[PDB]
Amino acid sequence: ENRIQIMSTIAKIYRAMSRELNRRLGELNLSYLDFLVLRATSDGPKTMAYLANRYFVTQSAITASVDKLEEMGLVVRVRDREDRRAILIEITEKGLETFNKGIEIYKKLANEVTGDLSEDEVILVLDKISKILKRIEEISQ
Amino acid sequence: ENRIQIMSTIAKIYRAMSRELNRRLGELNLSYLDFLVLRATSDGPKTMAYLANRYFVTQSAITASVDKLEEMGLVVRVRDREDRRAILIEITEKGLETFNKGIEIYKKLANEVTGDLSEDEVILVLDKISKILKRIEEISQ
Numbered sequence: 001e002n003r004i005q006i007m008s009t010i011a012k013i014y015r016a017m018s019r020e021l022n023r024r025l026g027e028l029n030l031s032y033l034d035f036l037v038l039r040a041t042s043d044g045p046k047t048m049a050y051l052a053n054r055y056f057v058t059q060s061a062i063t064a065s066v067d068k069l070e071e072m073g074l075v076v077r078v079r080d081r082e083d084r085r086a087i088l089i090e091i092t093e094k095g096l097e098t099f100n101k102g103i104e105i106y107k108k109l110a111n112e113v114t115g116d117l118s119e120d121e122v123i124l125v126l127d128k129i130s131k132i133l134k135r136i137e138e139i140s141q
Numbered sequence: 142e143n144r145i146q147i148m149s150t151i152a153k154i155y156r157a158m159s160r161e162l163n164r165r166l167g168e169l170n171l172s173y174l175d176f177l178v179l180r181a182t183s184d185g186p187k188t189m190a191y192l193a194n195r196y197f198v199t200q201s202a203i204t205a206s207v208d209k210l211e212e213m214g215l216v217v218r219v220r221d222r223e224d225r226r227a228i229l230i231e232i233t234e235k236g237l238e239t240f241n242k243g244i245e246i247y248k249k250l251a252n253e254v255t256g257d258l259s260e261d262e263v264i265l266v267l268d269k270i271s272k273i274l275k276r277i278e279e280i281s282q
């Protein structure tokens with residue numbers, strides 16, 4: 001019924017958004033996934049395992065995105081002073097600058113799509129779907 | 142602010158749901174995408190182009206899913222009596238039976254994740270995000 005429609009509508013929204021975001025982020029020379037790696041590392045270094053798990057993508061996909069971001073000078077691979085094997089992906093100043101640009105593109109698009117909604121409506125939906133996310137995350141992992 | 146959180150929460154929900162659905166649908170010998178092909182063809186034959194576009198996946202991905210579904214006897218490729226090139230993917234009786242089983246798995250999971258919400262809340266969110274979907278679809282294509 002409605003509970004099923006809520007989830008399928010959520011899925012359709014994500015697909016359309018991801019498609020438009022890849023298009024708009026293309027001007028920053030980034031794909032939606034590349035942007036996600038930047039968003040994840042913008043607040044602290046992340047392990048490649050974390051990146052693949054958090055955003056549900058293959059390790060080869062993350063390796064591909066990280067390699068690209070590294071070539072573009074947006075992130076760097078940091079190794080432990082002793083165990084150089086344990087690797088963290090750290091964002092660069094340039095990476096943060098590009099990320100910030102990505103955020104504004106995301107922000108602009110989000111305003112457009114949520115247009116028909118008032119600040120109140122927006123907040124109502126957010127509080128609610130936030131409970132859905134908490135549950136699926138508790139169930140899926 | 143909140144408009145950005147709404148979209149990112151929607152994205153996180155989809156990823157967690159898609160992951161759990163692939164797990165649960167695995168018992169029906171299906172992946173989330175296979176289920177989507179069945180859902181799309183359950184109400185009428187669909188072109189492979191439509192399938193790839195509607196669910197934002199590559200044509201090679203759809204070809205892979207359709208080939209599998211065909212081997213499993215869940216769908217068939219129908220050719221025009223004259224132009225045998227124009228191909229439609231039609232669901233089979235067995236395909237509909239499996240689809241129906243998939244729906245119940247989807248339905249069960251949707252009830253769980255939307256648990257903290259009452260029928261009213263569920264409906265409120267649905268009416269709202271439905272407007273978001275209408276807009277992004279108008280913008281993305």
Ligand SMILES: [Ca+2]
Pocket residue numbers: 138139140141
């Ligand atoms: Ca758990």
Ligand SMILES: [Ca+2]
Pocket residue numbers: 279280281282
């Ligand atoms: Ca348009």
